[PDB]
Amino acid sequence: IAHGDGRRPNKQRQYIVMKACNKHHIGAEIELAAADIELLFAEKETPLD
Amino acid sequence: IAHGDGRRPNKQRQYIVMKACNKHHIGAEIELAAADIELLFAEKETPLD
């Protein structure tokens, strides 16, 4: 906004802003027993099995 | 919580808690007079009995 005092005039301006992503990583660890993974494949035998 | 810092991720954990039962015992005493039990089985035939 210009005005009538002794101040210098104002040229038009311009702004340039640079933004960037930030990577994030997540990891969870599961253990599974070897007998558990095995007997999911071994055959049905008896009602207690 | 699975997080992206350098420390070791936790495996799965469980607790097994075993509670018990406390037992309590109450006793009160009752006195029946022998002059009072004796007429409980007797035969009555008069308006005083």
Q: How was this structure determined?
A: cryo-EM
CA distance B13 to chain A (A): 10
Please give the structure tokens belonging to residue A29. Answer: 């660890």
Burial class of residue A33, CB neighbours in 10 A (0-12, 13-18, 19+): exposed
Does B47 contact A at CB distance below 8 Å? no
Long-range contacts of B20-24 (CB under 8 A, 24+ apart): none
Q: Which helix (H) or strand (E) holds B36?
A: helix B34-37
Cβ(A29)–Cβ(B10) below 8 Å: yes
Interchain contact, A30 vs B11, CB within 8 Å? yes
Tokens 């037992």 -> residue: B23
Give the C-alpha separation, B23 to B25, whole Å: 7
DSSP code at position B4: S
Dihedral angle computed from the Cα positions of residues A39, A43, A44 and A45, in that order, rounded to the nearest 10 degrees: -110
Q: Resolution of the coordinates in A?
A: 3.8
Q: How many CA atoms lie within 13 A of A47 on its CB side?
A: 0
Does B13 contact A at CB distance below 8 Å? no
DSSP code at position A41: T
Tokens 């039962």 -> residue: B21
